[PDB]
Amino acid sequence: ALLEKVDPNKIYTIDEAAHLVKELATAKFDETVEVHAKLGIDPRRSDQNVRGTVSLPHGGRIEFRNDKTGAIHAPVGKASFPPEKLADNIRAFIRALEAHKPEGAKGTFLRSVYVTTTMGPSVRINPHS
């Protein structure tokens, strides 16, 4: 079972997650791996809008933007990808995100970061790993 391979309370490192999202993807087609991050901003305030692009080391087409709840979502590869390639794409997105903490936001910028495939449990990850 998948549920028992993921600890909902545990925070995983970028490497661990990459190797775990492969055991969660069971579909016969190739699921997309997606990164989500709840930002330390206020959706209410407009000068706290995060919108930038980034080139994935292993891919390339990706531009992010905060949603109505101050959250950022982005695909970082396919579940078929070798684990080390997912791990690099995950870091490249974060390291890029962190450079955009708006001047008008006080507090931790990365409040929660997790990874998911098209179906299944989410994998909470330590972004500083």
Swiss-Prot record:
GO terms for cellular component: large ribosomal subunit. One of its GO terms (biological process) is regulation of translation. It comes from the Bacteria. The keyword Magnesium does not apply. InterPro entries: Ribosom_uL1_bac-type (IPR005878), Ribosomal_uL1 (IPR002143), Ribosomal_uL1-like (IPR023674), Ribosomal_uL1/biogenesis (IPR028364), Ribosomal_uL1_3-a/b-sand (IPR016095), Ribosomal_uL1_CS (IPR023673). Signal peptide: none annotated. Keywords: Repressor, Ribonucleoprotein, Ribosomal protein, RNA-binding, rRNA-binding, Translation regulation, tRNA-binding. One of its GO terms (molecular function) is rRNA binding. Transmembrane segments: none annotated. Part of the 50S ribosomal subunit. The L1 stalk is quite mobile in the ribosome, and is involved in E site tRNA release. Binds directly to 23S rRNA. Protein L1 is also a translational repressor protein, it controls the translation of the L11 operon by binding to its mRNA. Belongs to the universal ribosomal protein uL1 family. PANTHER family: 54S RIBOSOMAL PROTEIN L1, MITOCHONDRIAL (PTHR36427), LARGE RIBOSOMAL SUBUNIT PROTEIN UL1M (PTHR36427:SF3). This is Large ribosomal subunit protein uL1. The lineage of its organism: Bacteria, Thermotogati, Deinococcota, Deinococci, Thermales. The gene is rplA.
